[PDB]
Amino acid sequence: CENWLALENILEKYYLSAFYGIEFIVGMLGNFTVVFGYLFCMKNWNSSNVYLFNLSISDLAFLCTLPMLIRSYATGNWTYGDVLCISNRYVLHANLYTSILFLTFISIDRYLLMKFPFREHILQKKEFAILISLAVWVLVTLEVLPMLTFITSTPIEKGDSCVDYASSGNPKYSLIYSLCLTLLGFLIPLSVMCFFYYKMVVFLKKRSNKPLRLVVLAVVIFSVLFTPYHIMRNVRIASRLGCSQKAINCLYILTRPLAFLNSAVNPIFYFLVGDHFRDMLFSK
């Protein structure tokens, strides 16, 4: 399967380098603008502000790894060592699953604000949103920890080793883990956003829009960008239970920067929470 190995090498060296390079540029400019916009324009933060700021810190953590990942793919090997293998492997998964969770909590915030504009409920308080943000980081750190435990079992001390559980290790355990992570990390938050879109539509039908705009954009962005990646990560593991195996790995490679395009386009949500932040940004 020499031809498929040529495709794998080209996809890593040229496709991943270019796609991650573009995401690094668009992501850094977008996230620094919305972060400095909050640091210099927002005086009194609400729940949605807290979640959006966390989403940007999550994006920026991922964007900071990209020069190392692009340099590794461009040279064909991992040379940064064991500490940087674990920190990079953590940040990539953590950015993926914290991002959909921050958007799920923003969606519930927009729904409660639609019913109770004055934010009287404890669930609608800024201090509670800070607690939920800390909960999101702890939950996602825990979801990602079995992958890190597997990585510490491999010979990372060699300095040039940094395995992907989709491609290495027991396929039976990797599949159970990857399917549980697809369910808890992707499908469950996506369903919760779908449920709250439906609750919003029912509320507005009874009373008979901006709240619908943010939730619909979140459901569309995550359905389109996370679905090919989640299908291929699971198909890559299942195929390990040949040329078919290398072809599936090439399809899997293609889907990875497509899922992380999320971190470059996420700053758009800053402009969908009704505060006229775009107008506030131009004034400064």
Epitope: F118, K210, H276
Partner: nanobody, 127 residues
């Protein structure tokens, strides 16, 4: 470019009614007007809000008792307060948002972005 003045503050017996006015000097058509109140030792809280389109919102504590209305021709916003109780004793203020459809989405957060406020009017509910 608008200036606000609240008026109508007075002494009400528990269960009594009172109407406040928020009068503007400057057009008011494109402004959202929210009513806020501050009791001694407590934080400021929104009570009622009217968008430039005419949509009204009420806090849960005043929902069954207050009515907000506007007269763009006279540039006045009224707050009819029915069934007032000692716990409603506070200085009532009105604020104006030039983004007419913004304020009433999240009055307690979006009030913080506003430069146009009145001086406040004292409402005292005591037996």
């Amino acid at each position: 470019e608008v200036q606000l003045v609240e008026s109508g503050g007075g002494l009400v017996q528990p269960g009594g009614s009172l109407r406040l006015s928020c009068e503007a000097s400057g057009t008011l058509a494109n402004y959202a007007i929210g009513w806020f109140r501050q009791a001694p030792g407590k934080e400021r809280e929104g009570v009622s809000c009217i968008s430039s389109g005419g949509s009204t919102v009420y806090s849960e504590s005043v929902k069954d008792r207050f009515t907000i209305s506007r007269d763009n021709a006279k540039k006045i916003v009224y707050l009819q307060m029915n069934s007032l109780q000692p716990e409603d004793t506070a200085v009532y203020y009105c604020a104006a948002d030039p983004f007419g459809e913004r304020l009433c989405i999240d009055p307690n957060t979006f009030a913080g972005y506003l430069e146009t406020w009145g001086q406040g009017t004292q409402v005292t509910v005591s037996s």
